[PDB]
Structures are given as C-alpha cells and as structure tokens.
C-alpha cells in the first residue's frame, strides 16, 4: 500500500527505519523527524487506550493484527488510522522488522 512504515524491533524501542513517501504526505511529517522513533508519536489526546494495549501486545506475540484507532498528524489534525501490521522473519524464522500499513478508518 501507499502508506507504511518499516520498525526494527531489534534496536531500542522499535524505531522507524523507513517511512514511505505517502505515510509523510498522510502524517505531515519529513523523514528526519521520525526515522528513529517509536510510532506512538502519532497517538494523542483521544486515543483510546485499550486499543494501543492490544497493539503493545500483538507486538509482544509478534502476530499479524488489524485495529482502529485515532491518530494525529504534526498539525495536530485527527485522522482514524486503520493500521496492520504484519511481522517480517528470515529463513531461520527469527523477527526481523515490522511493517505497518496505515489504511483509511472510520467511526
Ligand atoms: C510497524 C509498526 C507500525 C506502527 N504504526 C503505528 C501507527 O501508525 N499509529 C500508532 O498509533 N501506532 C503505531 N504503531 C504502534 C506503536 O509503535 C506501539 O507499538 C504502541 O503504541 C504500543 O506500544 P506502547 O504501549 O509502548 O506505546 C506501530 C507499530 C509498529 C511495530
């Protein structure tokens, strides 16, 4: 898809590694600011936070998963993520990334 990142859970705090070109156009933000950050900067004021908790979990499992939730871009504009994230092994079956795929949501 047009908008996605690319996390490496094996640097501290699962930063961004890549941003495609549409998650900047989506978010408002340039590769410098985020490369190397956790993407919980795109959560603000009125996201619920059970949904962050089960991503912390699928993330801690490291299964596929599919939520909604509110997120906000530099501007502080609120859009409704419909974010999944899909984990990236090697041959051997040992993690390697996380994609994430930013899809329009509703609600
Ligand atoms: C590849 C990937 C992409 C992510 N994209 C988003 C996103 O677009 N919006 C968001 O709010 N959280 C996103 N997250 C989730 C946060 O990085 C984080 O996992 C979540 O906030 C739960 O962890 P925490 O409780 O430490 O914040 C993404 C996570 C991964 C691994």
Same mark, same amino acid.
Request: a positive charge; charged letters at 30%.
């Given at each position: 898809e047009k908008n996605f990142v690319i996390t490496d859970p094996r640097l501290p705090d699962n930063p961004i590694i890549f941003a495609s070109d549409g998650f900047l156009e989506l978010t408002e933000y340039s590769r410098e600011e985020?490369?190397?950050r956790n993407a919980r900067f795109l959560q603000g004021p009125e996201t619920d936070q059970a949904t962050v908790q089960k991503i912390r979990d699928a993330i801690?499992? &490291?299964?596929?998963?599919? =939520?909604q939730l509110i997120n906000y871009?530099?501007?502080?504009?609120k859009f409704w993520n419909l974010l999944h994230? &899909?984990? =990236?092994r090697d041959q051997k079956g040992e993690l390697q990334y996380f994609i994430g795929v930013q899809l329009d949501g509703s609600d």
């Open positions: 985020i490369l190397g801690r499992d &490291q299964r596929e998963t599919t =939520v871009t530099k501007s502080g504009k994230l &899909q984990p =990236v």
